[PDB]
């Protein structure tokens, strides 16, 4: 036997040669993208062999074999339907319905401190299967969607028990919404501004703020498989002009000796405003999400980006603390680690399956995207993705993991 | 072909006979117990044909075919290692090390506020495992009865959601943890108790089961309900604890009257009776083994693993596991949800009902409590368990560093 | 000279005899009432001498002299305009305007939660004054009995401190206002109720009076105590209010059970009994006149102004006036202390027991409550009173702008 | 007759002439000081005619007459024992033992969080009295300058209310104590600070004084005001403390930013500048003698007792006394209001601005603080003071048990 050859006969049909368009539509139908970085060597060798001629072009058994031999292990598993969602092409048609029925919820206010009709969802599974619907490629800032990401970096570089010398691990209480510190004089959790600010003070001490920002950008690039990550100076300067609450928080933390020694608080706050003005798209962000869904390995490159300890802690606190005052209601009904931001984003993680990012700017009165919240409810109302759904007895729900 | 076609010829060895002890030690090493109710028909025909014929006593394939034919589906996936934990004999050897490593934790105080919990020796300590396929294991003081106390709150919440639905129940009780000092308030800001796992919410949930009927039938209804969760293993009642809970309970009488004034019960409720039904549900008796099957029922989407019976709706089980995650270990719940990530529920007798979804249910029991109300040995065992297996709610099933995955063997 | 004789010459005009009607209207304009108890030796001797003959009936200087001689000390100060309010008849006419300007305040709802407080007309309204010298005045429905309800908490707290002292009593109850919503917590952080003016603290204070003795004698002792505080004017009891309060009081039962687990009572307490005693104490009946004398007793350092009897220790009167200042009007207590500055205590029947220390006691009553539980017309009257006289606790007695000062001439 | 002979009566003793020391010792024994500003015309003419005449030197009846003629009203009231405390020499001797008995109280920590406060020996301790008539007395370290710190909060609140009225000021600041674990919240539920005596509320009051003007005139305007409140005795400024407060004040910067975010200031407020104006007002310096005259102005309905000038409106003085009563001693306010019953305000330098309305103002000072921030010797002196005289806000002015009443003999 030869595993490059018998994949050739899976796609060949019995016909003696394989056209290359038939290979790319068979591939794009697994849900992989032909621009997948784990597919570079194979797609290099196929642009190479269509300069060779231009009369077709079908591939022999040795030509297909020498196009795919260095990527066949990932390609067989794709074609023997061994990915986390085997029937990926049906699943996106459900994503499309969930997207389109959430598209009809017009209500909400867009943050004013900017079209209210943008709405996009993007999926990245832990195997790299991708799909998008709507305005999936318009940049927007993470705002508070960065709080799990910089927390993950902090825990990765420093460990849990150092990070949680400075910030708690529990939800406030649905009217300790207003206190900055718990009773041990630590912020409640990394997902509120006070805790996020302290987490930002922990990343890359000893070096100046420009290199700190670069290190987080490098880190976010690995999480997104080197897809789109940018920076909006406009939101930066407007958050730097409007942040009297974050300035109040910084002065309270300084006096209560809540930062690591040698901290410049007023600078840390400017670093904090930079990190909330970082730009993503729904597609780039969904890869970040899928990195957390995949135990710390980026799904479209295979690179270990975050330690399992960071990814677990981050998923744990997005569960309890991730959707502002709606976190309890959200944890009960949806049961997924999620994190919302005031541009309208919701970074969503279905552990061991997929990462998601949906984005629509109109917010509900608790600060969460209306359409995003609607989509998340519908998704778990249709598939056994809820954290405490049973994988064997699940009533009317769908399990996209099965055939 | 068929399937006995090859289950017998699987372990037969090639030899045309299986001695019956070699079949039962092969069975008991899967971790099933020969008294498993789904093995009733098969074990009867082996007791019988060890009377029909007693000179062997080996089994032909045509004799083995009539012992296992009505239990064959469970016996092949039992023997083709398709149970959730395939190498069960290694797993229990880990359970044993974690049991013996928590056994050295001296600390804690036994609950004394009633004389009937101060009679349980502080040196008792038992853990029991019931996986979702019926595999069992026990170590320590595992057949000793003790009262559920607040381990019963998730069980009765699940009963209420099953019979009444999520939206009726939660007109009367919330779905979030207090806040680590709204732990003292009886009501959240919508004038509902915070969640079913605290005393005020448990009392209100008790108010919802089996309305219109008197307390004797209400209790019977919950007891048949708990009997099915436990696969008809031991469920009892300690009248000694009930009478002593009934007059040391001024806290719950304070709660009951506040809830009446704030009109938190359903119409037509006799609150002082509800308080007596509530004191009874907290005196229900289990052992670690019985309770571990109850837990495994929540681990199995609502089906009891040792009978195959549907006991709770998936919506009830999911709601109950959701609220045990956030609110199940008193003030320690946030830390527990972070570090352990398993749905668990603590009681003042020393129990910790533990559920690892899709894998197993557990009950650990040691009476000494830490200052927050949780069994010290349980808390340590739970911490040690998750530090050794990728059972945490947000461990990854593919990349888990040095941890073990007993759902795998390679 | 002589003290009975010069006064005859103050009242005589120069005339050789005094008609006895001219003497009693001269006396009633002092503001004293002819039924004043410190005045009965004198009013006995005038009923005696209008049997003599009924053909006159004027008094010589020796006939007037031994009618008034055993009450002469009180009548000279009365007629030498030495009472705390010398021009009492202008003051009542000001009190009359305050009564009539509050009569136009319609709002409020009458309590329903007992069919005994919802039977009361929404238009009854009375104010009564008893000064620390005994001068009396009333306007409106001042002789209609109604229940003290929570106006009794300062009274029983005073009894408690009188019998046991401040340091014993405040082992069980605090001395401060909670905070404008720690109003919903039962206990402060030392596991004592916040202060005797909230139900939790009132319940605990009820547990301190007359321990060891059964509830029937405990109730008798408090009634004797209230009898002295009111100069033996009207004190009654509504069993209708009692039984309806005792079947509707689920919050008060919640409170007692909570205080019991938290070991808040003195040892040997039967908690469920104490709640029944607490419900009895809130069904005690007064009128605006009877209650105003109780108030005037607190205004007068513990002496009842119409009998001269020491009723409460000065230590009890100060503590009770302090906590009525801080804690006496439910959620309005801060606003009330700021604007009115008078120790007051409101109850759900519509009463406001009000004290102007060193001057007068008052009780006003109108059943409609505002959204915080206080009588609308009572609250309005109290505001106007201090907006017109320098009675506010931190008004200056020398520089007070346009306010009136009824203690001066 | 007229007042100058009848003064010449009493002072003569029978002699036909008065030695001038004998008049001055009789004058100093009323407790007036010969430097009292209302007495300067009399004292100039006595210094003058002790140049004119070196002949004795006693004063004839016309020599006494034209020295006291322009101050004769204040000297007869002084010499007819008509001042609020007539036996001033017995009273100060009581003040002396109260001071000496608090001198034995070892405890407390000197505020050290700024080096300008560690430099104050923990053994300085002074109390000063200014009665509402100008009578003065001091014991201990009463001429040592120290900063008002938070004793300035009632003073600037009084300035704001005098210029702006109660209803404008309290659009931005409440009227109640927080609650004794709302020690940490900045705003009550209407998004106003709880009251002017906490840091957030004081900061907001600083927003209201002299808006539209820059900080230099704003400060000058407040300094005029304090000068007149102290009858032009010592009011200074510690620039050393100001720089250390603007350097350590992240909690006030935390507070300023929170108040900015919730629009608690008036439109057009520069908040970080208001924080600098607030740090200046806390470094204003007094001594115990200077400050005690400030206190007496609040004791006197807005008139400074040693100059006769109207400085604050009666409404300002009442509001400020009300809130010092409830909120002026940090977390100890409820205990203090209960046990002491006097308007007081403490500061972290160790001062306690104290007011006994209608009688006297005081400032006590010893730098060691107890764990709640109040001067240990001050709190003790206050307890002893009210445990000795019927000055408590709700003591009775007629029935006060064994306590002393310095307004009587
Ligand atoms: O603990 C201590 C001492 C302390 C003090 C300070 C800090 N630490 C400790 N004080 C206590 N006194 N009483 C207690 N038990 C009471 C049960 C009866 N009450 C309620 N229970 N639940 C209630 N719900 C609501 O208020 C609803 C609501 C409405 C609006 C907003 N939020 C919530 S009111 C009061 C609590 S605790
Ligand atoms: O909300 C409003 C208005 C309101 C009032 C009432 C009801 N609803 C709304 N008031 C507010 N005032 N200030 C606010 N902002 C922060 C809270 C005060 N500070 C703190 N931050 N964290 C803190 N915690 C600790 O004390 C730790 C601790 C110790 C003990 C117990 N528990 C906790 S204190 C900084 C400013 S909000």
Reduced DSSP (H G I as helix, E B as strand, rest coil) percent helix, strand, coil of chain D, to 5: 45, 10, 40
Kindly give the interhelix angle for C288-299 and C314-327, rounded to the nearest 10 degrees. Answer: 110
Nearest CA-CA distance, residue D129 and chain C, Å: 18
Nearest to B362 by CA among B375, B344, B337, B386: B344
Residue D119 CB burial class (10 angstroms; 0-12, 13-18, ≥19): exposed
Q: Using CA atoms, how far apart are residues B184 and C384, in angstroms rounded to an integer?
A: 42
Tokens linked to B239:
């009248």
Provide the residue count of chain C.
409
For residue A129, is it left (φ>0), alpha (ψ between -120 and 50) or beta? beta
Nearest to B140 by CA among B100, B105, B108: B100
In 3-state terms, what secondary structure has residue B287?
Answer: coil
Q: Using CA atoms, how far apart are residues D132 and C102, in angstroms rounded to an integer?
A: 37
Using the 8-state DSSP alphabet, how is residue A13 labeled?
B
Nearest to A284 by CA among A344, A220, A339, A236: A220
Residue D184 dihedral angles phi and psi, to the nearest 5°:
-120, -20
According to DSSP, the residues that pair with A297 across neighbouring strands are A304
Long-range (24+ apart) CB contacts under 8 A made by B111-116 are B111/B348, B111/B349, B111/B350, B111/B367, B111/B369, B113/B248, B114/B241, B114/B244, B114/B245, B114/B248, B115/B244, B116/B238, B116/B240, B116/B241, B116/B244
- List the end-to-end C-alpha distance of chain D, in Å, as a whole number: 28
What SS3 string covers chain C? CCHHHHHHHHHHECECCEEHHHHHHHHHCCCCCCCCHHHHHHHHHHHHHCCCCCCCCEECCCCCHHHHHHHHHHHHHHHCCCCCCCCHHHHHHHHHHHHHHHCCCCCCECCCCCCCCCCCCCCCCEEEEEECCCCEEEEECCCCCEECHHHHHHHHHHHHHHHHCHHHHCCCCCCCCCCCCCCCCCCCCCCCCCCCCCHHHHHHHHCCCCCCCCHHHHHHHHHHHHHHHCCCCCCEECHHHHHHHHHCCHHHHHHHHHHHHCCCCCCCCCHHHHHHHHHHHCCEEECHHHHHHHHHHHHCCCECCCCCCECCCHHHHHHHHHHHHHHCCHHHHHHHHHHCCCCEEECCCCEEEEEECCCEEEEEECCCECCCCCEHHHHHHHHHHHHHECCCCCCCCCCCCCCECCCCC
Residue A46 contacts residue A20 (beta carbons within 8 Å): yes
For residue A190, is it left (φ>0), alpha (ψ between -120 and 50) or beta? alpha
Q: What separation in angstroms does the CA of B368 have from each of A28, B119, B121?
A: 60, 12, 9
In 3-state terms, what secondary structure has residue B38?
Answer: helix
For residue B43, is it left (φ>0), alpha (ψ between -120 and 50) or beta? alpha
Q: Using CA atoms, how far apart are residues D94 and D85, in angstroms rounded to an integer?
A: 13
The residue with tokens 């709601």 is B319
Tokens linked to C141:
């429905």
Query: After which residues does chain B break, using C–N > 2.5 Å?
Result: none
The residue with tokens 């539920």 is D189
Q: Using CA atoms, how far apart are residues B379 and C41, in angstroms rounded to an integer?
A: 84
Q: Using CA atoms, how far apart are residues A389 and B203, in angstroms rounded to an integer?
A: 26
What SS3 string covers A309-346? HHHHHHHHHHHHHCCHHHHHHHHHHCCCCEEECCCCEE
Q: Is D229 in the pocket of ligand 2 (CB under 6 A)?
A: no
Q: How far from the centroid of its chain's Cα atoms is residue A194's Cα?
A: 23
Q: Which residues contact C34 (CB under 8 A, 6 or more apart)?
A: C24, C27, C28, C43
Q: Using CA atoms, how far apart are residues D229 and D219, in angstroms rounded to an integer?
A: 15
Asked whether the bond before D282 is cis by omega within 30 degrees of 0, the reply is no
Sheet architecture: strand order including A140-141: A140-141, A278-280, A230-231
Q: Do chains B and A touch (3 or more CB pairs under 8 A)?
A: yes
- Nearest atom within ligand 2 for CA of residue A181: 22
The residue with tokens 């398709």 is B82
Q: Which residues contact D285 (CB under 8 A, 6 or more apart)?
A: D145, D146, D147, D148, D234, D235, D236, D237, D238
Q: What is the torsion angle, in degrees rounded to the nearest 10, for the CA atoms of residue B298, residue B301, residue B304 and residue B310?
A: 130
Tokens linked to A282:
């729904």
Element (H, E) at D208: helix D199-208
The residue with tokens 């009317």 is A396
Nearest to D327 by CA among B88, C338, B317, B305: C338
**Beta pairing class for D344-346 and B344-346:** unpaired
Q: What separation in angstroms does the CA of B307 have from each of B219, B300, B311, D217?
A: 23, 12, 10, 88
The residue with tokens 């105080």 is B109
The residue with tokens 């009190």 is C95
Q: What separation in Å is there between the alpha carbon of A184 and the centre of ligand 1? A: 21
Residue D357 dihedral angles phi and psi, to the nearest 5°:
-55, 145
In 3-state terms, what secondary structure has residue D123?
Answer: coil
CA A217, A222, A225, A226 torsion: positive or negative? positive
Name which residue sits closest to atom 28 of ligand 2, judged by CA.
Answer: A183
Q: Using CA atoms, how far apart are residues C167 and C397, in angstroms rounded to an integer?
A: 33
Residue A100 contacts residue A305 (beta carbons within 8 Å): no
The residue to mutate among D174, D177, D181, D184, having the most atoms of ligand 2 within 8 angstroms of its beta carbon, is D184
Question: How many other CB atoms sit within 10 Å of the CB of residue A213?
Answer: 18
Q: What is the torsion angle, in degrees rounded to the nearest 10, for the CA atoms of residue D394, residue D399, residue D403 and residue D405?
A: 80
Residue D140 contacts residue D99 (beta carbons within 8 Å): yes
Element (H, E) at B137: strand B136-140
Tokens linked to D288:
């115990």
Q: Using CA atoms, how far apart are residues D14 and D11, in angstroms rounded to an integer?
A: 9
Provide the residue count of chain B.
410
Q: Using CA atoms, how far apart are residues B60 and A119, in angstroms rounded to an integer?
A: 68
Which of C203, C245, C253 to substitute to test the interface with B, most B CBs within 10 Å?
C253
Q: How far from the centroid of its chain's Cα atoms is residue B42's Cα?
A: 27
Residue A83 contacts residue A127 (beta carbons within 8 Å): yes
β strands within A73-229, DSSP E: 120-125, 130-134, 140-141
Angle made by CA atoms A97, A142, A326, in degrees to the nearest 5: 65
Q: Using CA atoms, how far apart are residues A333 and A345, in angstroms rounded to an integer?
A: 19
Q: Is D184 in the pocket of ligand 2 (CB under 6 A)?
A: yes
Q: Which residues contact D371 (CB under 8 A, 6 or more apart)?
A: none
Q: Using CA atoms, how far apart are residues B295 and C165, in angstroms rounded to an integer?
A: 58
Q: What separation in angstroms does the CA of D116 have from each of A398, D148, D349, D351?
A: 72, 13, 9, 15
Tokens linked to A349:
């993680």
Q: Is D186 in the pocket of ligand 2 (CB under 6 A)?
A: yes
Using the 8-state DSSP alphabet, how is residue D186 labeled?
S
In 3-state terms, what secondary structure has residue C364?
Answer: strand
Nearest to C120 by CA among C285, C345, C243: C285
Tokens linked to B54:
């007693």
Residue B130 contacts residue B136 (beta carbons within 8 Å): yes
Q: Which ligand is nearest to the CA of B180?
A: 2
Nearest to B132 by CA among B307, B382, B288: B307
Residue A102 contacts residue A119 (beta carbons within 8 Å): yes
Q: Which residues of B fall within a CB distance of 8 Å from A170?
A: 180, 334-335, 337-338
Which of B191, B203, B250 to substitute to test the interface with C, most C CBs within 10 Å?
B250
Residue B388 dihedral angles phi and psi, to the nearest 5°:
-115, -20
Kindly give the interhelix angle for A282-293 and A308-321, rounded to the nearest 10 degrees. Answer: 110
Tokens linked to B139:
């170590």
In 3-state terms, what secondary structure has residue B286?
Answer: strand
Q: Which residues of C fall within a CB distance of 8 Å from B257?
A: 250-251, 253-254, 257
According to DSSP, the residues that pair with C362 across neighbouring strands are C129, C354
User: DSSP letter string over A231-291?
Assistant: E-HHHHHHHHHH-HHHHHHHHHHHHTT-SPTT--HHHHHHHHHHHTTEEE-HHHHHHHHHH
Name which residue sits closest to atom 31 of ligand 2, judged by CA.
Answer: A183
According to DSSP, the residues that pair with C303 across neighbouring strands are C310
Nearest CA-CA distance, residue B358 and chain A, Å: 6
Residue A170 marked in a binding site: no
Asked whether the bond before B57 is cis by omega within 30 degrees of 0, the reply is yes
According to DSSP, the residues that pair with B137 across neighbouring strands are B129
Q: Using CA atoms, how far apart are residues A120 and A136, in angstroms rounded to an integer?
A: 5
Nearest to D213 by CA among D149, D273, D280: D273
Q: Which residues contact B233 (CB under 8 A, 6 or more apart)?
A: B287, B289, B290, B293, B306
Name which residue sits closest to atom 8 of ligand 2, judged by CA.
Answer: D189
Q: Using CA atoms, how far apart are residues B132 and B359, in angstroms rounded to an integer?
A: 6
Q: What separation in angstroms does the CA of A196 have from each of A77, A165, A169, A259, B179?
A: 40, 14, 12, 12, 19
Nearest CA-CA distance, residue D238 and chain C, Å: 32
Tokens linked to D15:
């002699």
Provide the residue count of chain D.
409
In 3-state terms, what secondary structure has residue C404?
Answer: strand
Q: Using CA atoms, how far apart are residues C118 and C101, in angstroms rounded to an integer?
A: 25
Q: Using CA atoms, how far apart are residues D269 and D267, in angstroms rounded to an integer?
A: 6
Provide the residue count of chain A.
403
Experimental method: X-ray
Residue B350 contacts residue B368 (beta carbons within 8 Å): yes
Q: Using CA atoms, how far apart are residues C225 and A68, in angstroms rounded to an integer?
A: 103
Using the 8-state DSSP alphabet, how is residue B104 labeled?
T
Q: Which residues contact B410 (CB under 8 A, 6 or more apart)?
A: none
Q: Do chains C and A touch (3 or more CB pairs under 8 A)?
A: no
Q: Using CA atoms, how far apart are residues D347 and D111, in angstroms rounded to an integer?
A: 10
Residue D341 contacts residue D386 (beta carbons within 8 Å): yes
């Amino acid at each position: 036997p030869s595993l490059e050859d018998l994949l050739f006969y899976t796609i060949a049909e019995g016909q003696e040669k394989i056209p290359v368009h038939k290979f790319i539509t068979a591939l794009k139908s697994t849900g992989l993208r032909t621009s997948d970085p784990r597919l570079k060597e194979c797609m290099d060798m196929l642009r190479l062999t269509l300069q060779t001629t231009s009369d077709g072009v079908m591939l022999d058994k040795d030509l297909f074999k020498k196009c795919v031999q260095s990527n066949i292990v990932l390609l067989t598993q794709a074609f023997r339907r061994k990915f986390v969602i085997p029937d990926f092409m049906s699943f996106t048609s459900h994503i499309d319905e969930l997207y389109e029925s959430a598209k009809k919820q017009s209500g909400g206010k867009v943050a004013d401190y900017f079209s209210p009709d943008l709405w996009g969802v993007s999926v990245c599974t832990v195997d790299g299967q991708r799909h998008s619907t709507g305005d999936t490629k318009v940049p927007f800032c993470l705002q508070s969607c960065v709080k799990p990401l910089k927390y993950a970096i902090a825990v990765n570089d420093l460990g849990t028990e150092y990070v949680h010398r400075y910030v708690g691990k529990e939800p406030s209480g649905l009217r300790f919404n207003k206190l900055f510190l718990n009773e041990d004089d630590k912020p409640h959790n990394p997902m509120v501004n006070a805790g996020a600010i302290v987490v930002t003070s922990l990343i890359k001490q000893g070096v100046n703020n420009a290199e700190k920002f670069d290190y987080v950008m490098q880190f976010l690039n690995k999480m997104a498989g080197n897809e789109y990550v940018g920076f909006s100076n406009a939101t930066f300067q407007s958050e730097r002009e409007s942040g009297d609450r974050n300035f109040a928080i910084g002065y309270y933390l300084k006096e209560k000796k809540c930062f690591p020694e040698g901290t410049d608080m007023v600078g840390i706050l400017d670093f904090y405003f930079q990190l909330c003005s970082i730009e993503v798209t729904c597609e780039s962000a969904s890869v970040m999400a899928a990195t957390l869904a995949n135990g710390g390995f980026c799904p479209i490159t295979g690179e270990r980006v975050l330690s399992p300890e960071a990814v677990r802690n981050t998923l744990s606190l997005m569960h309890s603390c991730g959707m502002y005052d709606f976190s309890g209601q959200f944890a009960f009904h949806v049961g997924l680690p999620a994190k919302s931001g005031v541009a309208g984003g919701i970074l969503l993680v279905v552990p061991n399956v997929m990462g998601m990012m949906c984005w629509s700017p109109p917010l509900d009165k608790m600060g969460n995207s209306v359409k995003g919240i609607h989509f998340c409810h519908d998704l778990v109302s249709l598939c056994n993705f809820h954290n405490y759904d049973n994988l064997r007895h699940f009533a009317k729900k769908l399990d996209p993991r099965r055939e």
